């Protein structure tokens, strides 16, 4: 009747139960990864606090899933998938990338979970691209073949940052002299927002403050600091440029989806930003992406919802 | 018994016959688009010099294939797919992008048709990335779902150029002044070799010669112009960076394939260039792409071969 679903990112692990018949998510609880020694220990606690027998599960984790060994870059947890499934006695245990799960949540979303940013209307049967600026920059794609939804994972957040304008080029130069390779995550993320502010200040021959991401948005929203105001606007433009590159690359006439990370915290600024202009700023191919819609997912837990969908399809349910 | 396959790009129009039972290609001929008023005229002309009755066809064309109206924009022809099919009395007439066709040639290629550049071995069932620098920059992706090879076409050659080094950033700066948005096609193509040469010369505060892509390649191999050898060396580096971004974005552990448009004319220079190092210069995710193989396709007619593969799969045959 019920299956276990999870969304683990860095220091937070979120666990919930999923209705096998319908895919509804219920009984969601967030745990702290610092207070538990392993992912397995957290699952043991959840399964007894809720008095539910569970035999199938699917956990989303924010790191590359390649083989049986899962080592978290942000967290210290590391485990073998086949051993956890045996240890917990599960019949199915699916370990997937966090944006693999987010991509799988799209067929479950209603119109009330989306806010459109330009474009006209999706083309049925054409690919879909998903990305989000959160702890890092996650990217995934989704294609419908026959009756199966096929998620295409990857590490698209670590491709080379692609500056277009002179302002964007100046950011690359300051970041390049610090770390070498500058990936898109270094600018399109929570820490990326800090990098934008630091480089904009360093370019003015000044030392940046030790500002946290939430500080930069709040000062930019209050217009109390021009360095932060510039950073936030530059972030919104780079967001559109990244998404427009994805849409061209995979011909995603099914739409481009933004899994809400830090963006919903400055949603009104985002709507008035230059995001949509940057999305279409593609030379002779502005008209190619002009009608492709863009959606922000305001669902409070797409990762849990899409973990259940991925499992149910794996178990033979048609979404 | 036979079906018609075609590969049309720019000025040329290549037509051939395809064995429906086997997928073998034969009786290929290269017509000129300047000497005929339409692609229909070429097909009508070809179908009578070879005296073969044909009902099914697949033509690959180097332009985006969005709807029924097809306009090349690299040629004067433009036509409706539905209208051309009716005129020829075909039952099936598939019209596809030229790198959709190249992507479907991959299942039919043998070891003799591949040259490996680094990486170790492909993982079965993982996505494949295909790209090629010719008159334009083509990109396609290929995934094997159940029994079917699914081609994901796109216009990925028109994404933003992504400079990494200081020398690359200069190229973007100079080209941005001349054309505005700078696509990867502007540096990674036949014409892009000239842009790389010209930006290098203008960066040196000199005036560029009116060279052609043939001039740059031959002068580079002859050590006749240091401007032209630098342009060629930077071409090979950016080729590697671009391919590495493709492998990160879609997790292409099935391999990255480079369709040779201009590469084979300087094959040995390419082998000695910094292509592989550029392919893997991806910060923390060098190890992620380190083992992914890169193959150069040395088949002289992959577009015809893949067009047959696409039509055959559409007709119900298994590849
Ligand atoms: O969490 C979003 C993304 O951040 C990146 O740093 C990770 O490598 C991805 O696996 C993850 O999907
Ligand atoms: O020929 C390779 C590529 O060149 C580009 O200019 C075209 O827009 C693509 O449709 C084509 O696939």
Residue numbers in the entry:
A (entry chain B), B (entry chain A): 3 to 321
Please share excerpts from the published article on this structure.
Glucokinase (GLK) catalyzes the first reaction in the glycolytic pathway and is a target for regulation in a wide range of organisms. To date, there are no ecGLK structures reported together with the other substrate ATP or the product ADP. This work presents the structure of apo ecGLK bound with phosphate and the structure of ecGLK in complex with both glucose and phosphate, implying a role for phosphate in regulation of the GLK activity. In the ternary complex, phosphate is bound adjacent to glucose, and the B factors for the α4, α5 and α9 helices were further reduced, while r.m.s.d. spikes were observed at the end of the β10 sheet and within the α6 helix of the β-domain. This structural characterization suggests that phosphate could influence the activity of GLK by altering glucose binding and modulating interactions with a loop-interacting regulatory protein.
A ternary complex consisting of GLK, glucose and phosphate is also reported in this work. The crystals of the phosphate-bound glucose–ecGLK complex were obtained by soaking ecGLK with 5 mM glucose and were grown in 100 mM bis-Tris pH 6.5, 200 mM magnesium chloride, 25%(w/v) PEG 3350. The crystal structure was determined by molecular replacement and refined to an R factor of 0.2034 (Rfree = 0.2580) at a resolution of 2.54 Å. The small and large domains retain the α-helices and β-sheets found in phosphate-bound ecGLK while there are domain shifts to account for the glucose binding. The phosphate-bound glucose–ecGLK complex crystallizes in a more highly ordered space group (P212121) compared with the phosphate-free form (P1211), suggesting that phosphate binding stabilizes the conformation of ecGLK.
